[PDB]
Design an enzyme around this catalytic site. Sequence first.
Site, PDB file in Angstrom:
ATOM      1  N   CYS A   1       0.813  -1.227   0.000  1.00  0.00           N
ATOM      2  CA  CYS A   1       0.000   0.000   0.000  1.00  0.00           C
ATOM      3  C   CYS A   1       0.839   1.266   0.000  1.00  0.00           C
ATOM      4  O   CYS A   1       1.579   1.527   0.951  1.00  0.00           O
ATOM      5  CB  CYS A   1      -0.952   0.031   1.219  1.00  0.00           C
ATOM      6  SG  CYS A   1      -1.907   1.574   1.425  1.00  0.00           S
TER       7      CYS A   1
ATOM      8  N   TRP B   1      -9.148   6.690  -0.195  1.00  0.00           N
ATOM      9  CA  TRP B   1      -9.496   7.427  -1.406  1.00  0.00           C
ATOM     10  C   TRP B   1      -8.602   6.931  -2.568  1.00  0.00           C
ATOM     11  O   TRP B   1      -7.611   6.228  -2.354  1.00  0.00           O
ATOM     12  CB  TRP B   1      -9.371   8.944  -1.208  1.00  0.00           C
ATOM     13  CG  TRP B   1      -8.072   9.445  -0.657  1.00  0.00           C
ATOM     14  CD1 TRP B   1      -6.920   9.687  -1.357  1.00  0.00           C
ATOM     15  CD2 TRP B   1      -7.792   9.797   0.705  1.00  0.00           C
ATOM     16  NE1 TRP B   1      -5.939  10.150  -0.511  1.00  0.00           N
ATOM     17  CE2 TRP B   1      -6.450  10.230   0.758  1.00  0.00           C
ATOM     18  CE3 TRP B   1      -8.543   9.780   1.886  1.00  0.00           C
ATOM     19  CZ2 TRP B   1      -5.844  10.641   1.946  1.00  0.00           C
ATOM     20  CZ3 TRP B   1      -7.942  10.194   3.064  1.00  0.00           C
ATOM     21  CH2 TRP B   1      -6.607  10.620   3.086  1.00  0.00           C
TER      22      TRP B   1
ATOM     23  N   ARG C   1       0.160   4.536   2.777  1.00  0.00           N
ATOM     24  CA  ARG C   1       0.347   4.300   4.202  1.00  0.00           C
ATOM     25  C   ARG C   1       0.805   5.507   5.024  1.00  0.00           C
ATOM     26  O   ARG C   1       0.859   5.418   6.253  1.00  0.00           O
ATOM     27  CB  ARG C   1       1.326   3.152   4.407  1.00  0.00           C
ATOM     28  CG  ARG C   1       0.659   1.790   4.361  1.00  0.00           C
ATOM     29  CD  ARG C   1       1.688   0.703   4.576  1.00  0.00           C
ATOM     30  NE  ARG C   1       2.606   0.603   3.436  1.00  0.00           N
ATOM     31  CZ  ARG C   1       3.756  -0.058   3.471  1.00  0.00           C
ATOM     32  NH1 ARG C   1       4.134  -0.668   4.594  1.00  0.00           N
ATOM     33  NH2 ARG C   1       4.528  -0.115   2.386  1.00  0.00           N
TER      34      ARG C   1
ATOM     35  N   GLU D   1      -5.409   4.032 -10.511  1.00  0.00           N
ATOM     36  CA  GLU D   1      -6.258   2.862 -10.295  1.00  0.00           C
ATOM     37  C   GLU D   1      -7.402   2.848 -11.300  1.00  0.00           C
ATOM     38  O   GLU D   1      -7.669   1.831 -11.944  1.00  0.00           O
ATOM     39  CB  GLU D   1      -6.816   2.837  -8.867  1.00  0.00           C
ATOM     40  CG  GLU D   1      -5.752   2.848  -7.772  1.00  0.00           C
ATOM     41  CD  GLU D   1      -6.371   2.751  -6.379  1.00  0.00           C
ATOM     42  OE1 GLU D   1      -6.888   1.667  -6.072  1.00  0.00           O
ATOM     43  OE2 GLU D   1      -6.346   3.740  -5.606  1.00  0.00           O
TER      44      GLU D   1
HETATM   45  C1  HEM Z   1      -6.240   6.737   2.072  1.00  0.00           C
HETATM   46  C2  HEM Z   1      -5.779   6.654   0.820  1.00  0.00           C
HETATM   47  C3  HEM Z   1      -5.167   5.355   0.244  1.00  0.00           C
HETATM   48  C4  HEM Z   1      -4.539   5.283  -0.936  1.00  0.00           C
HETATM   49  C5  HEM Z   1      -4.279   6.447  -1.925  1.00  0.00           C
HETATM   50  C6  HEM Z   1      -4.118   3.907  -1.123  1.00  0.00           C
HETATM   51  C7  HEM Z   1      -3.437   3.408  -2.207  1.00  0.00           C
HETATM   52  C8  HEM Z   1      -3.301   2.072  -2.505  1.00  0.00           C
HETATM   53  C9  HEM Z   1      -3.095   1.499  -3.823  1.00  0.00           C
HETATM   54  C10 HEM Z   1      -2.977   2.266  -5.167  1.00  0.00           C
HETATM   55  C11 HEM Z   1      -2.995   0.179  -3.675  1.00  0.00           C
HETATM   56  C12 HEM Z   1      -2.784  -0.820  -4.827  1.00  0.00           C
HETATM   57  C13 HEM Z   1      -4.174  -1.355  -5.118  1.00  0.00           C
HETATM   58  C14 HEM Z   1      -4.271  -1.955  -6.482  1.00  0.00           C
HETATM   59  O1  HEM Z   1      -3.429  -1.606  -7.346  1.00  0.00           O
HETATM   60  O2  HEM Z   1      -5.202  -2.772  -6.698  1.00  0.00           O
HETATM   61  C15 HEM Z   1      -3.163  -0.151  -2.263  1.00  0.00           C
HETATM   62  C16 HEM Z   1      -3.126  -1.416  -1.704  1.00  0.00           C
HETATM   63  C17 HEM Z   1      -3.490  -1.775  -0.419  1.00  0.00           C
HETATM   64  N1  HEM Z   1      -3.938  -0.898   0.563  1.00  0.00           N
HETATM   65 FE1  HEM Z   1      -3.950   1.229   0.424  1.00  0.00          FE
HETATM   66  N2  HEM Z   1      -4.523   3.166  -0.021  1.00  0.00           N
HETATM   67  C18 HEM Z   1      -5.181   4.015   0.846  1.00  0.00           C
HETATM   68  C19 HEM Z   1      -5.750   3.624   2.047  1.00  0.00           C
HETATM   69  C20 HEM Z   1      -5.750   2.367   2.618  1.00  0.00           C
HETATM   70  C21 HEM Z   1      -6.497   1.924   3.800  1.00  0.00           C
HETATM   71  C22 HEM Z   1      -7.467   2.810   4.618  1.00  0.00           C
HETATM   72  C23 HEM Z   1      -6.199   0.628   4.014  1.00  0.00           C
HETATM   73  C24 HEM Z   1      -6.666  -0.353   5.121  1.00  0.00           C
HETATM   74  C25 HEM Z   1      -7.225   0.058   6.270  1.00  0.00           C
HETATM   75  C26 HEM Z   1      -5.258   0.228   2.993  1.00  0.00           C
HETATM   76  C27 HEM Z   1      -4.696  -1.015   2.890  1.00  0.00           C
HETATM   77  C28 HEM Z   1      -4.229  -1.583   1.744  1.00  0.00           C
HETATM   78  C29 HEM Z   1      -3.956  -2.984   1.588  1.00  0.00           C
HETATM   79  C30 HEM Z   1      -4.116  -4.125   2.627  1.00  0.00           C
HETATM   80  C31 HEM Z   1      -3.454  -3.109   0.151  1.00  0.00           C
HETATM   81  C32 HEM Z   1      -3.029  -4.429  -0.508  1.00  0.00           C
HETATM   82  C33 HEM Z   1      -3.987  -4.691  -1.652  1.00  0.00           C
HETATM   83  C34 HEM Z   1      -3.892  -6.133  -2.014  1.00  0.00           C
HETATM   84  O3  HEM Z   1      -2.908  -6.803  -1.592  1.00  0.00           O
HETATM   85  O4  HEM Z   1      -4.798  -6.609  -2.735  1.00  0.00           O
HETATM   86  N3  HEM Z   1      -5.010   1.296   2.172  1.00  0.00           N
HETATM   87  N4  HEM Z   1      -3.332   1.040  -1.584  1.00  0.00           N
HETATM   88  N1  LIG Z   2      -7.682 -10.925 -10.393  1.00  0.00           N
HETATM   89  C1  LIG Z   2      -7.374 -10.260  -9.498  1.00  0.00           C
HETATM   90  C2  LIG Z   2      -6.948  -9.466  -8.576  1.00  0.00           C
HETATM   91  C3  LIG Z   2      -7.133  -8.095  -8.777  1.00  0.00           C
HETATM   92  C4  LIG Z   2      -6.681  -7.192  -7.815  1.00  0.00           C
HETATM   93  C5  LIG Z   2      -6.046  -7.656  -6.675  1.00  0.00           C
HETATM   94  C6  LIG Z   2      -5.570  -6.664  -5.654  1.00  0.00           C
HETATM   95  C7  LIG Z   2      -6.529  -5.488  -5.604  1.00  0.00           C
HETATM   96  N2  LIG Z   2      -6.177  -4.600  -4.486  1.00  0.00           N
HETATM   97  C8  LIG Z   2      -7.190  -3.541  -4.490  1.00  0.00           C
HETATM   98  C9  LIG Z   2      -7.044  -2.496  -3.408  1.00  0.00           C
HETATM   99  C10 LIG Z   2      -6.799  -2.792  -2.063  1.00  0.00           C
HETATM  100  C11 LIG Z   2      -6.708  -1.751  -1.133  1.00  0.00           C
HETATM  101  C12 LIG Z   2      -6.865  -0.425  -1.548  1.00  0.00           C
HETATM  102  C13 LIG Z   2      -6.787   0.630  -0.644  1.00  0.00           C
HETATM  103  C14 LIG Z   2      -6.947   1.927  -1.127  1.00  0.00           C
HETATM  104  C15 LIG Z   2      -7.167   2.173  -2.485  1.00  0.00           C
HETATM  105  N3  LIG Z   2      -7.319   3.436  -2.956  1.00  0.00           N
HETATM  106  N4  LIG Z   2      -7.247   1.136  -3.337  1.00  0.00           N
HETATM  107  C16 LIG Z   2      -7.100  -0.138  -2.891  1.00  0.00           C
HETATM  108  C17 LIG Z   2      -7.199  -1.176  -3.803  1.00  0.00           C
HETATM  109  C18 LIG Z   2      -5.866  -9.015  -6.475  1.00  0.00           C
HETATM  110  C19 LIG Z   2      -6.307  -9.924  -7.421  1.00  0.00           C
HETATM  111 CL1  LIG Z   2      -6.037 -11.667  -7.109  1.00  0.00          CL
END
Ligand code: HEM
Ligand SMILES: N#Cc1ccc(CCNCc2ccc3ccc(N)nc3c2)cc1Cl
Lengths: 411, 410
Positions: A108, A280, A111, A285
């Site tokens: 993420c 947000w 963070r 994305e």
């Molecule tokens: C507040 C603004 C935030 C932004 C701009 C942001 C941004 C991102 C982005 C761009 C990703 C990649 C997601 C993707 O490409 O599918 C991500 C992943 C992730 N985010 Fe954040 N995030 C935010 C808040 C949060 C919050 C509030 C949480 C949890 C409480 C969080 C937890 C995670 C986790 C666990 C992933 C891993 C996604 C996965 O493994 O599928 N994020 N974040």
């Molecule tokens: N197919 C598929 C596939 C597609 C996507 C993913 C990971 C998607 N993660 C999405 C995500 C998680 C947390 C977020 C927190 C904030 C934010 N702005 N976007 C998030 C977006 C995993 C798999 Cl296996």
Amino acid sequence: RFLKVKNWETDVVLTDTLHLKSTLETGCTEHICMGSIMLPVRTKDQLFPLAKEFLDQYYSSIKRFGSKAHMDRLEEVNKEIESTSTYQLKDTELIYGAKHAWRNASRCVGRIQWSKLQVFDARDCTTAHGMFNYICNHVKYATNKGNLRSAITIFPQRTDGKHDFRVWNSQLIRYAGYKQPDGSTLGDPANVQFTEICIQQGWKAPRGRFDVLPLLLQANGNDPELFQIPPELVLEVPIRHPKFDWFKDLGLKWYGLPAVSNMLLEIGGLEFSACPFSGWYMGTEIGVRDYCDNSRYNILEEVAKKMDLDMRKTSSLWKDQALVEINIAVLYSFQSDKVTIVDHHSATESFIKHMENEYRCRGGCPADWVWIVPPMSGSITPVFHQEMLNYRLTPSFEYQPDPWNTHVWKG
Amino acid sequence: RFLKVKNWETDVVLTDTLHLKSTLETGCTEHICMGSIMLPDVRTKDQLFPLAKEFLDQYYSSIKRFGSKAHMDRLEEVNKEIESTSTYQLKDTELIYGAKHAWRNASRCVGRIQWSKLQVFDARDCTTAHGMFNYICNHVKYATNKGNLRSAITIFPQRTDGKHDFRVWNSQLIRYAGYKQPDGSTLGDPANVQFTEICIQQGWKAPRGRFDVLPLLLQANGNDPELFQIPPELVLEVPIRHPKFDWFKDLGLKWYGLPAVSNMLLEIGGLEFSACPFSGWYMGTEIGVRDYCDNSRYNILEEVAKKMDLDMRKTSSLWKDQALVEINIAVLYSFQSDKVTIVDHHSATESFIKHMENEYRCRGGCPADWVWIVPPMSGSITPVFHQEMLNYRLTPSFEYQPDPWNTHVW
Ligand code: HEM
Ligand SMILES: N#Cc1ccc(CCNCc2ccc3ccc(N)nc3c2)cc1Cl
Ligand code: HEM
Ligand SMILES: N#Cc1ccc(CCNCc2ccc3ccc(N)nc3c2)cc1Cl
Ligand SMILES: C[C@H](O)[C@H](O)[C@H]1CNc2nc(N)[nH]c(=O)c2N1
Ligand SMILES: C[C@H](O)[C@H](O)[C@H]1CNc2nc(N)[nH]c(=O)c2N1
Ligand SMILES: [Zn+2]
């Protein structure tokens, strides 16, 4: 053991000692790196070490390590474990856990905001209707008329794995996808399977290109139930371009609130299988992945067509050109509607500062380069040039299998 | 132990067995992935023979002669040479197999679909820097081929006892000079600043411009390195123009046609070739994205943005991104208009997916470093972004080695 990471644009070197507290496994070995691989009940034997580790960490943070209050809590918990084969988190502990799962989320980039998280305790919830109500309140609160606020709603932990709470939606708000008889897809191809489930479960599908899906909610291991989110709660942004007037006529829009609902939250050995969270959007994305992935809305051609690009030779970089325009439009639109969004330049920049801060006050910041670097314009963001260490800490957000693959249907 | 990689854009799944034959380490462990880390003395004779044998076993297997007495013959022959001379010499055939397979095994290389078509120049009879210069001029001329570039490698004598090391001190046969001039600003290439004045420090006279081709600094048999200027007529350069904006020429940008990396170490069957310059041809983004737009390099984004009259207000207009695209359009346009070989990052990643499917099907796998294979722009609109890849180290291999000046006993 010390470990150094170098930024190759700034020559900044950091030292990681936090990785030493790493429990879980990476998937890597000495003879193989699995860094680009997408995917990585519980007994008393293993539960109380996990509980003790968490409580040690918690009381350290609140500067009470070794206090009587620390010792009593440990005593309280293992007795509750021995007696009941599980335990309950105090409110303060549940909040600490949720925040640190986020803080520990190596993939993420957002963070820097981890300390500011609104935690909604929904552990008293017993039915799907109760779930719907909680989720409605989460959405209204988080959306905040466009001034987005991070939040998480935490439903009851797993017990014997037969009474799980699950949100079957991958995200609280997402568009339906409909495979047509001719092979084409109307709407979001990513959600075709789930859409079909909803339809089978009784959802009357409007069958348009941007239909917000119904919530599909499972409480206490019962069969899931359908709920329509009140439309006045779903904030959406029509997509326009600042210079291209025909762009609005593409008929594109997106929802404002990214709210991930299919992950598992692990805190001190307890598993929360329903823990929808929201922040947000980073512009890419939507503008890069949702709109331009071949397996998604896939609009590059149509956009490039109306830009009149030379589309026959890929060395014209017509795909690259169209991609930038689309991401400009997504950004323009959210800003003009005063809906919170961050560009990938600002986001990656703030993440470098965060990560630096984390090395200083914490001794490291686990980070997944493959996921942290933006899906466009990689090397002109400062994270591309940043070496990162990836390791797993708890508390954590984990993946779990899709509920339709594991659910025992009641009828 | 029999691993699977998935393409998430196509749902194609390949099974990897090749990784089993990996020997060297990754830097990773069960507890930590070092996948994004950029960089994670002679061998004894009982260290060398298993290394020799493993190489020989795969060489003879490749020519459908595993277990042949001709195979056995070579094994004993090499073993006796090792026992006697504490090293051994590669047959021409083995040397050619070794080089091609070192390229086949480079997990950070996107252009590996061409690995079998490599012209190998045996320079193991070279004894002096002047001799090195000659071999290198011939390499450059052959490889360039009037714009129609051809992959080539030139292999100098192997390491012996670390005293006789052949090295090319340049990182590439052709690179632009970089000077620290009075304003505190940088003329030319900032990445070569240190090398650009180890050169004058030994005698070079710089034409102090922004695109001065550096002199070769060649080290033969461990002796002090010597300066040679590549004949300008052997250095093919491309003026950088844009196919729609023609204020672009006034930027006065150019680049060279031939990417020829000269500072790596080639390991084959335990033997170390410390001077082994090789060349192929450019992927467009190496120049347009990295060479031109890195902040540690020519850093020309603002300048370009200004002439496009873009909103450089704050980051959100994506002016950097808009300019980056146009810049890379111009590089490709220039090279193509001069009929100088170049590949765009879309074409080359699509080539690599196909190469993977070839390698999984005929070899059982293909080691690949996702962090390096994904282009530095437009990442997720290239097929490789959605490709799972397994990274592991196979030998023969190209490895890194210390910069000569930090080692050389003067
Ligand atoms: C507040 C603004 C935030 C932004 C701009 C942001 C941004 C991102 C982005 C761009 C990703 C990649 C997601 C993707 O490409 O599918 C991500 C992943 C992730 N985010 Fe954040 N995030 C935010 C808040 C949060 C919050 C509030 C949480 C949890 C409480 C969080 C937890 C995670 C986790 C666990 C992933 C891993 C996604 C996965 O493994 O599928 N994020 N974040
Ligand atoms: N197919 C598929 C596939 C597609 C996507 C993913 C990971 C998607 N993660 C999405 C995500 C998680 C947390 C977020 C927190 C904030 C934010 N702005 N976007 C998030 C977006 C995993 C798999 Cl296996
Ligand atoms: C012929 C067309 C070729 C193309 C398009 C190509 C492409 C690339 C690219 C883009 C990189 C990334 C390097 C960087 O970004 O700095 C790379 C790395 C590499 N290439 Fe290839 N290459 C080609 C030929 C070759 C040849 C002929 C060899 C060896 C004989 C080779 C061996 C390597 C090695 C060892 C690396 C790793 C670089 C490092 O570790 O620093 N390539 N290649
Ligand atoms: N500092 C630093 C540093 C900066 C860059 C690199 C990578 C250098 N290797 C680049 C390379 C190697 C082989 C190539 C073959 C073909 C081609 N078109 N480009 C190449 C480019 C390595 C280091 Cl240690
Ligand atoms: C195969 C590869 O791991 C996969 O396509 C990853 C690459 N990096 C990513 N990075 C982000 N932020 N989101 C993603 O979905 C992916 N997908
Ligand atoms: C720190 C990080 O590994 C570094 O920026 C890497 C990223 N990936 C790369 N990929 C390529 N092709 N070339 C590079 O120089 C780099 N640099
Ligand atoms: Zn790894």
